Design a protein around this ligand. Structure first.
Ligand code: NAP
Ligand code: NAP
Ligand code: EMF
Ligand code: EMF
Lengths: 310, 310
């Protein structure tokens, strides 16, 4: 009926698929832009069976983008690192169409406007800042989402649950705090805020109080859940820093991010601002899956590990 | 006609596809075993148009493998690291069929029976040795191929030609020698030796004299070819060794391999044995693409970078 029509770029992506599913679950007409040569053929059929409208095309097709923009109300971009500046093609179409009511660029991680990182990562978040500055300059309605750490992604990365090893790697001292959220929830909440007036032209941060922890605490809780003890092996901070300067790209990017998230504790190193919105306080009918619930999921039906594109 | 029938496992693989193409180019009836869910659909269509017989199935289908073995003469395995011991399923079928004239296990790299490496890599090559010991124990005719470094793979890895950066990473001092060969040639020569009596039950090493070089020399020759100078940044050996002990799996595997190849110089640290066969000396009608010809290829029509599975 009155439901906003949503267009999602990168909908077949790691986090994008959860936004598409969340959009459909909420009853929103959902358009998914995808490359003609995408290998996500089985996922696209799933989206279709769920009610999504699949649109094949390339970001270089300016006219196609403009005509598509005219048919929707909300635009969400879940594109990857290599395509950050390609979002200017999406922005140009939005500017020409002129009817878009909300645009969410591809952030979904740290809050780039209040934190800094080592060169490898700083370069990438500076590109994300460029997109933001352009949105504001053009007076385009927006919502900036800081989703913090993707939980399944990082529980897999830090605990390597699919590995029967007796040792576990800890980055730095392991005392740095960080927040992580279940992908399925990040996707649903993102759709919710994209139409919520309370998130119009604001930064929304996903930081439920039940999802804040340190590497050492996560390991301890996992050990209790599975009844096994691990030998902790630490990677000194000075070691991590040196690597970001010597190793080639993209190899040095994940290293810089590990420093940012697990040594500098960038997802928890700041206090909320007056205009900030913490998403968990928004909907009494919903809640983020907690860390304990996440660990239970990895015991009963663990999701496969993943690796972002650099 | 009287051409040996060849069955290739992992034929859709990075190096496997070159063996499939080489087999067909040489006029050999070629069978390609592939998983039903493989995403190499377009590549399979190419093989099919070239004359290959596509066989879909899983390695766990023992009966299917046995019946398949009965229809061929030569078996080549180009499976990946994660599937090294899965080759025992292939070997069991070969043993039951009893008609195979030559089996080449998935080596195609360093000569594991004469070199040792750091733990992350030593563990993998020990699995390859296990396959070898089993073949010999069973008196199965074989050929062990040490193809040394895949050239396109490593020119991409070391020079990062698709990167406009002004610096280049060097592992260790950069003075360690190594040999690298063009994938297309590795594929063709592999088919040739698989039926060549001169390679029966012998180790064949691919080491053409025109393809031996050091990291520093490769950089210097590339600089001359493209007319640009790079700043060399070295990663100390002690640094590389430390990482293999602290980083988790599979991250520490590539690092251990880099140490073995470019610091220890494992592809060039030994002299030939009495029974060794160096492939470039075998066919006066053929020759391996040289390093200079390889650099020219990267200037005129460079192949995309690749990353092995761990
Ligand atoms: N907070 C965290 O822990 C965390 C973790 C990972 C990622 N991230 C962030 O989440 C966002 C999305 O990351 P992701 O891992 O979900 O992305 P992804 O799955 O790597 O990629 C998203 C989609 O981009 C499309 N695409 C790929 N290459 C393209 C190209 N060359 N041109 C045009 N489209 C292309 C693909 O869709 P089609 O095949 O349909 O075209 C793909 O499914 C990023 O901003 C990233 O930084 C954050
Ligand atoms: N010397 C060097 O520089 C160098 C470089 C790279 C690799 N290597 C060596 O070359 C050999 C092959 O490596 P590669 O990179 O070419 O392999 P690859 O392309 O990663 O894999 C080969 C094939 O394995 C099949 N496969 C994948 N997962 C499987 C599974 N779970 N079960 C059964 N089959 C599966 C796939 O075929 P389908 O999809 O058709 O089933 C795949 O195309 C290895 O021995 C490796 O160590 C050496
Ligand atoms: C360390 C392995 O993960 C990564 O390198 C990148 C994908 C992870 C990531 C990317 C972008 C981010 O903002 C972020 O903050 C939570 C996390
Ligand atoms: C450093 C990046 O490459 C690798 O980690 C592995 C795929 C390379 C490889 C794998 C197996 C080998 O025997 C070998 O010898 C030349 C090389």
């Amino acid at each position: 009926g009155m439901k906003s029509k949503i267009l999602i770029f990168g909908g077949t992506g790691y986090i994008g698929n959860h936004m598409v599913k969340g959009s459909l679950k909420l009853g929103h007409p959902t358009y998914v832009f995808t490359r003609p040569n995408s290998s996500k053929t089985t996922l696209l059929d799933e989206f279709q069976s769920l009610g999504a409208i699949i649109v094949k095309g390339e970001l270089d097709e300016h006219e196609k983008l403009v005509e598509l923009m005219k048919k929707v109300d909300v635009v969400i971009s879940a594109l990857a690192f290599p395509q950050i500046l390609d979002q200017f093609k999406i922005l140009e179409a939005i500017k020409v169409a002129g009817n878009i009511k909300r645009f969410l660029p591809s952030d979904f991680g740290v809050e780039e406007d209040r934190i800094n990182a080592l060169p490898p990562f700083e370069a990438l978040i500076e590109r994300k800042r460029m997109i933001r500055r352009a949105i504001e300059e053009a007076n385009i309605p927006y919502t900036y989402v800081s989703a913090n750490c993707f939980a399944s992604y990082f529980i897999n990365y830090l605990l390597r649950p699919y590995d029967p090893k007796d040792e576990i790697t800890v980055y730095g001292t392991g005392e740095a705090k960080f927040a992580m959220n279940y992908e399925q929830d990040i996707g649903l909440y993102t759709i919710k805020v994209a139409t919520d007036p309370r998130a119009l032209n604001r930064v929304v941060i996903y930081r439920p109080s039940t999802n804040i922890i340190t590497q050492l605490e996560l390991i301890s809780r996992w050990e209790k859940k599975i009844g096994k003890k691990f030998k902790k092996i630490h990677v000194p901070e000075e070691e991590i820093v040196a690597l970001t300067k010597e190793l080639p790209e993209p190899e040095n990017i994940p290293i810089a991010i590990l420093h940012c998230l697990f040594i500098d504790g960038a997802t928890m190193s700041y206090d909320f601002k007056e205009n900030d919105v913490e998403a968990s306080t928004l909907y009494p009918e919903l809640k983020f899956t907690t860390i304990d619930e996440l660990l239970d999921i990895f015991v009963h039906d663990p999701p496969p590990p993943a690796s972002a594109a650099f």
